[PDB]
Design an enzyme around this catalytic site. Structure first.
Site, PDB file in Angstrom:
ATOM      1  N   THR A 147     -38.143   2.181  -8.063  1.00  0.00           N
ATOM      2  CA  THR A 147     -36.934   2.200  -7.868  1.00  0.00           C
ATOM      3  C   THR A 147     -36.097   1.820  -9.333  1.00  0.00           C
ATOM      4  O   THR A 147     -36.511   0.916 -10.114  1.00  0.00           O
ATOM      5  CB  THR A 147     -36.530   1.114  -6.980  1.00  0.00           C
ATOM      6  OG1 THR A 147     -36.846   1.251  -5.389  1.00  0.00           O
ATOM      7  CG2 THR A 147     -34.864   0.753  -6.894  1.00  0.00           C
ATOM      8  N   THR A 148     -35.246   2.571  -9.452  1.00  0.00           N
ATOM      9  CA  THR A 148     -34.251   2.237 -10.568  1.00  0.00           C
ATOM     10  C   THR A 148     -32.888   2.363 -10.441  1.00  0.00           C
ATOM     11  O   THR A 148     -32.128   3.262  -9.731  1.00  0.00           O
ATOM     12  CB  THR A 148     -34.514   3.277 -11.834  1.00  0.00           C
ATOM     13  OG1 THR A 148     -35.852   3.508 -11.947  1.00  0.00           O
ATOM     14  CG2 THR A 148     -34.011   2.600 -13.141  1.00  0.00           C
ATOM     15  N   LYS A 179     -29.933   4.254  -1.644  1.00  0.00           N
ATOM     16  CA  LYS A 179     -30.097   2.928  -2.221  1.00  0.00           C
ATOM     17  C   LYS A 179     -28.558   2.130  -2.589  1.00  0.00           C
ATOM     18  O   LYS A 179     -28.752   1.210  -3.086  1.00  0.00           O
ATOM     19  CB  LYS A 179     -31.133   2.922  -3.328  1.00  0.00           C
ATOM     20  CG  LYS A 179     -32.281   3.345  -3.126  1.00  0.00           C
ATOM     21  CD  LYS A 179     -33.483   3.215  -4.215  1.00  0.00           C
ATOM     22  CE  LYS A 179     -34.758   3.764  -3.848  1.00  0.00           C
ATOM     23  NZ  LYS A 179     -35.668   3.711  -5.154  1.00  0.00           N
ATOM     24  N   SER A 221     -42.926   4.830  -9.428  1.00  0.00           N
ATOM     25  CA  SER A 221     -42.179   4.486  -8.456  1.00  0.00           C
ATOM     26  C   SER A 221     -40.892   5.040  -8.453  1.00  0.00           C
ATOM     27  O   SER A 221     -40.019   4.521  -7.650  1.00  0.00           O
ATOM     28  CB  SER A 221     -42.253   3.024  -8.337  1.00  0.00           C
ATOM     29  OG  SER A 221     -43.895   2.494  -8.224  1.00  0.00           O
TER      30      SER A 221
END
Lengths: 213, 201, 202, 217, 122, 204, 199, 220, 199, 202
Positions: free
Chosen positions: J1-2, J33, J169
């Site tokens: 996740t970023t 997200k 990820s």
């Protein structure tokens, strides 16, 4: 850390008759929940009178197989004759015990003919404890095959039933039936079934299909 | 596994069941737990089948070489000592082995218990295995040095049998050997199911 | 630790921070992490100080004997291969991340990475150490084929400044070294010489 | 190797008419970090065989070195004999089992492809010495994602052309790029025919992301 | 270490070193032994009776165990070596085997020892 | 394992207009046998039996609390319980202990008290129900029982053949298990009667 | 579990040991002997691990006998005790240590009667009386209460009986019979076994 | 276990295999893994079987109460909320992995629900040990706005991939088709697996089993 | 460690228990009684953990007596056994489980003599004869060998003696004395203690 | 996740990747997200999916009731405070890294960080998630006071592209959302729309 073992599945069966020996196995090579291949039989022809079934960890199966081959050749060179079935059994016992503290993860069943031409089956544990049997199943579905064979071949728990010796025909259909049931209940057993018949004429190989799920 | 052996006036009685398990699963019921080392030396099998068989086979080899070299046959004590010394070098490595070496000697009937732990003791009666406690119960209640041969046979057979009754890891068949001065004789190999009908009714 | 190497036409450019820590304490705030392996071959060290020092000494020794025995300026790839051999053979006993860089009359300016595993790969630019993690993006968006020597100098200087700003295991002073056929030009950026970046206010 | 460091993910392989094709992305990952995005994980081992490796890249480089030396040593003789693919497969099996048995394994899973004497060869070798032959192979997540597709095709059309195989491989690599978090959109395809071993340069997979606009409904 | 063939064959098929050893024996004090029914006796000749010498320290009749005694003739030092080795083996026999030691067994051990020294390098 | 502490085996088998349920008779503590007449099959009404294998305590306890709730059911409502309903009841009872389960894997065998249609099922230790048209097994020799049942079971069997089949299956499966046996008991139930037999078995 | 006891008088050493060889919950032997003759005037009472006791004891025995055959005279109880202590101490930090506790009783023509105590760590200690095993915890005090350096061998046997009776009373382990030997100027003498006719 | 779900032009296709395993032994060859939630909402279940059973039944009950009170047909969001909140409350200790699909006033909706209580709304989802194979099939052969038979074919293909490539899966294929005005609960849409015919007759004849004790009890 | 034994005859129940209360390596008590009277015709033989035995046994006892005082009649041995089994089973998965193994002997005016065996897991089993403890492993077989359902109480006592003698012979634990009681139509009768005059 | 959030004059800009993994397998390659908390208040989620979803729902509920009861557009600081309360009170049972951002008639465009501990701080820009580590340097050297809305858009787009390139990820698609008094403008950058950077060759 690091584990040098992995369970590869596989079922193996051997029956001894008056003048024959059957060594059968499924052809599925699996790991975890996956199928590595559907064409990997667990039967190995050693001599013209002896076949061995190896189930368990595939790496050890391969290694052990090649070691047995090399050592057969060595006995031939050294004695100018081929190894009898009993001799191969005993030698296997020593080979397995040489790794007593780092075992071959292999269940072995030898099937063949003795020197009287009679059927002989030898069953082993991974460290070389071995005995002679009328019939024996090893591998994942062993606990499914054994009790039926104790019933239909040993006539155990059967009242007033004639003790007729096992014919090749009946033995063959028995092998096919037990592997068909095992393929139903064992997730490791399936894809195909290879049967090796050993008689004075030599070694026959038959292949029957099992379900692919 | 249930094995026993006792010495009396007429030699050494050796008896064993024939069950072999892998966990709860019964792998075999046709196990020869009395090991014919020699025509004159009997061993038993308890613990690891492979360990007992292999090491007592090595023992047999050594005994034969002994007979060739010294033009005489090894004593029961020397054989048991040989086995014990061989096994002692692998102590702590995981060998599981409880055996009884039985024979007839210049000192007469010989019976030695040999452990994978290091034990090596001479004695009158012994019982090894997961059923040993049950066999001891009847064997001790029936044992006499002055037993008759048939009485001895019946005692050993019954002890192994009751042991099969109580112990889940013992059963199959009762095998019975007799060690006499001129060597051992394979006395009997009765099935437990037969013995059930013989004993109960 | 933050180490960096950029290849240009006439040779290479090396950069490293100067912080060596044992826990949160700084045992040395002015470490030299650029280590000469030969006349025109340097290595950037990262990981265990003992390990990297020992390995660098060993490689310097071997490469010296080798170059004398061949009577030629040693290849950068050769020094890199020596580091690779040691770092791979004793991978379970060493904690070292190395960057071998230098100039060589046969293949020119070159940069090789020898990370913790013991593998070896040639790269246009290489970064290593704890701080490297924070400048992967920057170095990816700032790199450009055909940089001049001074451009590569400013480049490594900037990247290292950023890493040192963010990484606690990195900091102190900046050490740079340009390598070409000309020779070795080492310099040190300290205090205000170190590039600064506008910090967020309101 | 006890703890793998820089690693490569899945390797694909499939037999076809008069040849074998192998696929592998050019990524060396440091844990979750896509650290080295331009390394080859495919080696040409002589003219009739080729190798692809998943797992630790350093060990793969070691094997590449040893194998290379073996090939050179053999070709020095010029006795009209050369290592068959099955022979390289056998040797590799023996090596991996040996290292495994020394409790110091080579952390690799390898796919060996070859063509010799009119027949296609495809072998799988584990780091434990588990080895076998199959018409299709997939290491790592390929064993969960690509292999069902490959098998689905090969059990409805056992004999593939080079083009059908290449297309199949591209689709599989695409699926892997969709569902494997340690893959990269930059891969190599190696092919063995009787003409030899060809390694086609950096290829990209076309991707579709229309399902990005199927949130609400 | 010293790895040279000392004892070798001569063209006529003789082992010269062994023959010279036998000569060395032939220069030894006379030793005799006889076997009876319930008694066995061994007697050795010239004790090199210097009279200024302690007889006890120069006896040529030793005991190997409570069961077995022995006399000798030849090089006294070599005899000391062989004797002590025989003693060790006599005890090791009791360790490895509950039974003591037969005369033929220890004789066989000593003999094999000598033969070994007739066929070993150095 | 906890289930293997006492051992034991329970099997159920469908017939034509009949049904069968069997169990070994051994009560032992690990390797030691204590008794050879341990009850593992309990009547939960006419033509409806339940078989419980596993930890003996939970066999008895689950049986007892089941009889509790069942009696209450047959009192509140003016009827004997239907097989499906008994299955759901047991499932509920077991899932109430989802995070501290009874160690038993029950087997239910019975005829619909209104019709005569045979019903068999088995459940998890936490009450996941499973109905089949052939057979169900539970115990320390499950693999064995599966092996026998897959090879002996025919569809439309008459009472005698159902008996012979389930008996041979139980006997031969149990005889390859160290902690199961010391006798076998079979209840074969049909519309008009219930036959209860004890088999001639090995005692080792 | 095993019990040893030694009591030194002015011109004798009295020793006793239990006769049980036990494994698990059963007595496998009831006429087991814990003593080892090493010379004409030396006894070695060895106790502990299964294989280590006999291996160690017999090794020491054959070496002492070897000394006797090589030199013509026997070892003194002191030289013997220090010999076994040296052997036991050298194996302590080796791959093959020996878990043995031991008593060494002896009589020298010069220094007289001797009783040595040895821990499995190979600590050697001369004592007027000693004991090994769990039973020692119940017997030593009794000795402390009733021992005098001029105790007669008759009184010594009586005292021994007191200790063994105490064992019969408080100890949870069976131990119905006891080997009893005594060493003096004339050598090792076997005394009648102290037994308690249970069944 | 291999379960899957897909969204097509007129609604939703759910798919499941029918094998239930205890360890590495097949216990059930015909397990039903497609559960009724509401007349317009269905749920495939993988993970801990009892947990999926009770979770799905509980939610079905609460939803029946809900619709009974509202007099309207339940929404899929409602089922999703109830499930995910219940599951989150238990912190993953309830091993329910679910594929939830239905048709609303707002149209067709497909969620995947994980035992910890996270959900994802997606046009196609897979759960279970055989989920990666099925997902491969989807990622290779899925297009938006498919027709009914095409969608059924795709889903059955994914479930088949799982069946033949996963040891946890096997036996038959169940489909459930849900459209704005139709509900096809195809129990076994396909039996690609069969037990081989018995070569022998191991039938035991009356009297072959020895009996120690008999007792006949007449009923009514 | 503790030993219990029960033998059921046609019209009587014979019970016996060891009289040792032991801790560590010592016997702290030699006249300990393992039996508990719960009715005029019911005995509870309890064995196991230190505090759990007496607590549990006495709880059950006072509850049975309570039943008697509240209703006028006593509990049957069966109802009693199932009562103790219910109590033991309910505490099993609680914070306070009881590590007790037990025998329940009884005589009912209707169903006759009864002997119940209870594991610490609360599994209830009616048996013609039973035993608890390590000693059981050496005694059960003997019973198996010599028990007949029509055994006289005299022969029962003899058999009991055989078992206890076997204990004296093979068991490593001491156990010199044994409480022996018998239940019939007339109630609980105390028999002379079976002892083996060791010391 | 970023995840990433940049504040500008008229409001804020939100960005996130779309990769949700369970191990090395991607359970969802197209995750949303960016989660609306109110009409003009969004949150960026990282960490446990279950945790962040649950917390976001709870906060949405609470803030809805609050805003109705006050009859005013809720403050961004209030939503942030709610997240802070939940994330701090259950810090030992939650694995969540949140970025609350939005517009508010009282204080304008604002960005708050609520990291794993449960602390709360307002920032000019904020980054979070596994991938954030790789773009600290870039974001530090690229940020500039007084960016326009489109500039912030391009900024977050670039940063996220870099992170997604480096982090395993992270990946999939880019989701952006601009928030101001005007309203909410959401868009999605996929495939070639995603900024690319010259990759090293020779």
């Amino acid at each position: 850390r690091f584990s040098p073992y992995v369970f590869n599945g596989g079922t193996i069966l051997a029956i001894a008759g008056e003048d024959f020996a059957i060594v059968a196995s499924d052809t599925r090579l699996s790991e975890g929940f996956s199928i590595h291949t559907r064409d990997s039989p667990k039967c190995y022809k050693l001599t013209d009178k002896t076949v061995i079934g190896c189930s368990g960890f595939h790496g050890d199966c391969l290694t052990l197989t090649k070691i047995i081959e090399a050592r057969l050749k060595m006995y031939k060179h050294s004695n100018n004759k081929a190894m009898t079935t009993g001799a191969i059994a005993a030698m296997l016992s020593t080979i397995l015990y040489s790794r007593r503290f780092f075992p071959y993860y292999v269940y072995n069943i030898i099937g063949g003919l003795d020197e009287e031409g009679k059927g002989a089956v030898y069953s082993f544990d991974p460290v070389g404890s071995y005995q002679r049997d009328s019939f024996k199943a090893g591998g994942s579905a062993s606990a499914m095959l054994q009790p039926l064979l104790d019933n239909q071949v040993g006539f155990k728990n059967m009242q007033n039933v004639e003790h007729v010796p096992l014919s090749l025909d009946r033995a063959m259909r028995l092998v096919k039936d037990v592997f068909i049931s095992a393929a139903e209940r064992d997730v490791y057993t399936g894809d195909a079934l290879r049967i090796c018949i050993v008689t004075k004429e030599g070694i026959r190989e038959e292949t029957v299909s099992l379900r692919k799920d | 596994t249930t094995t026993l052996a006792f010495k009396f006036r007429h030699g050494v009685i050796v008896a064993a069941d024939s069950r072999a398990t892998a966990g709860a699963y019964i792998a075999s019921q046709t196990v020869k737990k009395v090991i014919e080392i020699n025509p004159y030396l009997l061993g038993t099998m308890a613990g690891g089948a492979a360990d007992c068989s292999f090491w007592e086979r090595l023992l047999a080899r050594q005994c034969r070489i002994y007979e060739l070299r010294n033009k005489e046959r090894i004593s029961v004590a020397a054989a048991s000592k040989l086995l014990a010394n061989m096994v002692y070098q692998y102590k702590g490595m995981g060998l599981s082995m409880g055996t009884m070496i039985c024979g007839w000697d210049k000192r007469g009937p010989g019976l030695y218990y040999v452990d994978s732990e290091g034990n090596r003791i001479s004695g009158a009666t012994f019982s090894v295995g997961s059923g040993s406690v049950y066999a001891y119960g009847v064997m001790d209640r029936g044992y006499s040095y002055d037993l008759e041969v048939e009485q001895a046979y019946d005692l050993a057979r019954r002890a192994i049998y009751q042991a099969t009754y109580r112990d889940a890891y013992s059963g199959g068949a009762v095998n019975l050997y007799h060690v006499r001065e001129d060597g051992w004789i394979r006395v009997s190999s009765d099935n437990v199911a037969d013995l059930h009908e013989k004993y109960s009714g | 630790t933050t180490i960096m190497a950029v290849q240009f036409d006439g040779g290479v450019v090396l950069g490293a921070d100067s912080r060596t820590t044992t826990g949160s304490y700084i045992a040395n705030r002015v470490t030299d992490k650029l280590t000469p392996i030969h006349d025109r071959i340097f290595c950037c060290r990262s990981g265990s100080a003992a390990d990297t020092q020992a390995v660098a000494d060993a490689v310097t020794y071997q490469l010296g004997f080798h170059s004398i025995e061949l009577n030629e300026p040693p290849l950068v790839h050769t020094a890199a291969s020596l580091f690779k051999e040691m770092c791979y053979r004793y991978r379970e006993d060493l904690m070292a991340g190395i960057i071998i860089a230098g100039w060589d009359p046969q293949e020119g300016g070159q940069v090789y990475s020898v990370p913790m595993g013991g593998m070896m790969v040639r790269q246009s630019f290489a970064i290593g150490g704890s701080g490297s993690s924070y400048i992967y993006g920057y170095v990816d968006a700032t790199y450009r084929e055909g940089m001049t020597k001074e451009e590569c100098l400013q480049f490594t200087a900037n990247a290292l400044a950023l890493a040192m700003e963010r990484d606690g295991s990195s900091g102190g002073v900046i050490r740079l070294a340009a390598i070409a056929e000309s020779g070795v030009e080492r310099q040190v950026l300290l205090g205000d010489q170190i590039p600064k970046f506008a910090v967020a206010t309101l | 190797t006890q703890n793998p460091m820089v690693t490569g993910t899945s390797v694909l392989g499939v037999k076809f008419e008069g040849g074998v094709v192998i696929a592998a992305d050019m990524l060396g990952s440091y844990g979750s970090l896509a650290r080295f995005r331009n390394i080859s994980r495919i080696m040409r081992v002589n003219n009739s065989t080729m190798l692809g490796a998943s797992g630790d890249y350093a060990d793969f480089q070691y094997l590449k070195q040893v194998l290379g030396q073996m090939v050179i040593d053999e070709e020095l003789l010029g006795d009209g004999h050369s290592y068959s693919p099955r022979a390289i497969h056998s040797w590799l099996t023996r090596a991996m089992y040996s290292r495994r048995s020394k409790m110091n394994p080579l952390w690799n899973t390898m796919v060996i492809g070859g063509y010799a004497d009119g027949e296609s060869f495809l072998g799988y070798v584990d780091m434990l010495g588990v080895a076998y032959e199959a018409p299709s192979l997939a290491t790592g997540y390929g064993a969960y994602l690509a292999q069902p597709l490959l098998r689905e095709v090969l059990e409805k059309q056992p004999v593939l052309s080079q083009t059908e195989a290449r297309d199949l491989v591209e689709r599989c690599m695409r699926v892997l790029y969709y569902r494997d978090a340690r893959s990269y959109n930059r891969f190599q395809i190696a092919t063995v025919t009787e003409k030899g071993v060809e390694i086609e340069g950096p290829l990209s997979t076309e991707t579709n992301w229309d399902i990005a606009h199927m949130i609400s409904g | 270490s010293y790895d040279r063939a000392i004892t070798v064959f001569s063209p006529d098929g003789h082992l010269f070193q062994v023959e010279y050893a036998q000569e060395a024996v032939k220069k030894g004090s006379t030793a005799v032994g006889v076997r009876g029914r319930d008694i066995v006796v061994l007697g050795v000749e010239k004790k090199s009776v210097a009279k200024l010498q302690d007889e006890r320290t120069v006896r040529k009749i030793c005991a190997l165990d409570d069961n077995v005694c022995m006399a000798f003739a030849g090089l006294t030092a070599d005899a000391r070596i062989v004797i002590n080795r025989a003693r060790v083996e006599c005890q090791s026999h009791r360790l490895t085997v509950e039974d003591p030691v037969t005369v033929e067994y220890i004789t066989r051990y000593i003999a094999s020892l000598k033969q070994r020294y007739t066929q070993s390098n150095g | 394992s906890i289930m293997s502490y006492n051992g034991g085996a329970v099997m159920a088998m469908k017939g034509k207009n009949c049904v069968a349920i069997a169990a070994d008779r051994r009560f032992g503590i690990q390797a030691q046998m204590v008794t050879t007449d341990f009850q593992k099959i309990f009547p939960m009404g006419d033509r409806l039996y339940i078989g419980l294998a596993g930890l003996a305590t939970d066999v008895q306890t689950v049986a007892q609390r089941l009889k509790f709730r069942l009696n209450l059911y047959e009192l509140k409502e003016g009827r004997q319980i239907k097989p499906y309903t008994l299955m759901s009841m047991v499932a509920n009872l077991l899932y109430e202990k989802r995070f501290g389960p009874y160690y038993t894997e029950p087997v239910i065998a019975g005829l619909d008290p209104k019709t005569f249609k045979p019903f068999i099922c088995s459940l998890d230790l936490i009450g996941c129900p499973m109905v089949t048209d052939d057979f169900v097994v539970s115990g320390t020799c499950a693999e064995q029982m599966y092996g026998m049942c897959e090879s002996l079971w025919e569809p439309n069997m008459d009472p005698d053949h159902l008996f012979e089949t389930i008996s041979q299956a139980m006997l031969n499966a149990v005889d390859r298990d160290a902690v199961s046996g010391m006798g076998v008991i079979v209840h074969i139930i049909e519309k008009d009667k219930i036959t209860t037999r004890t088999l001639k078995a090995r005692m080792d | 579990m095993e019990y040893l006891i030694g009591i030194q008088g002015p011109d004798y050493v009295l020793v006793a040991s239990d006769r049980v060889a036990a494994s698990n919950i059963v007595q496998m032997k009831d006429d087991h002997d814990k003593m080892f003759k090493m010379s004409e005037k030396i006894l070695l009472l060895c106790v502990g691990e299964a294989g280590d006791t006999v291996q160690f004891a017999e090794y020491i025995q054959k070496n002492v006998q070897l000394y006797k055959m090589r030199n013509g005279y026997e070892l003194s109880p002191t030289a013997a005790a220090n010999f076994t202590r040296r052997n036991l101490a050298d194996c302590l930090r080796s791959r093959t240590p020996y878990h043995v506790n031991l008593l060494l009783a002896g009589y020298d023509e010069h220094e007289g009667p001797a009783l040595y105590y040895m821990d499995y760590l190979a600590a050697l200690a001369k004592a007027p009386f000693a004991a090994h095993g769990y039973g020692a915890f119940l017997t030593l005090s009794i000795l402390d209460r009733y021992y005098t350096p001029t105790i007669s061998r008759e009184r010594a046997v009586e005292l021994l009986r007191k200790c063994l009776e105490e064992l019969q009373k408080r100890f949870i382990l069976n131990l119905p019979t006891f080997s009893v030997r005594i060493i003096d100027k004339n050598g090792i003498h076997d005394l009648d076994n102290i037994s308690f006719p249970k069944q | 276990t291999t379960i899957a779900g897909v969204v097509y032009k007129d609604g939703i296709v759910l798919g499941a295999d029918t094998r239930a395993t205890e360890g590495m032994v097949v216990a059930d060859k015909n397990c039903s893994k497609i559960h009724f939630i509401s007349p317009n909402i269905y749920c495939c279940g993988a993970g801990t079987a009892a947990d999926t059973d009770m979770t799905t039944q509980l939610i079905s009950s609460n939803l029946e109460l809900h619709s009974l009170s509202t007099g309207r047909l339940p929404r899929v969001v409602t089922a999703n909320r109830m499930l995910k909140q219940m599951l989150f409350r238990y912190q993953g200790y309830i091993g329910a992995a679910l594929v939830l699909g239905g048709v609303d006033v707002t149209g067709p909706h497909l969620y995947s629900i994980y035992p910890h209580g996270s959900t994802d709304k997606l046009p196609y989802v897979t759960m279970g040990s055989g989920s990666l194979a099925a997902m491969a099939v989807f990622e290779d052969k899925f297009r938006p706005d498919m027709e009914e038979e095409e969608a059924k074919n795709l889903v059955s293909e994914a479930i088949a991939a799982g069946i033949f490539n996963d040891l946890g899966s096997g036996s038959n294929i169940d489909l459930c088709v849900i459209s704005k005005n139709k509900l096809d609960f195809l129990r076994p849409y396909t039996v690609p697996n069969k037990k081989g015919t018995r070569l022998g007759r191991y039938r035991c004849e009356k009297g072959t089993t020895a009996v120690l004790t008999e007792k006949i009890t007449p009923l009514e």
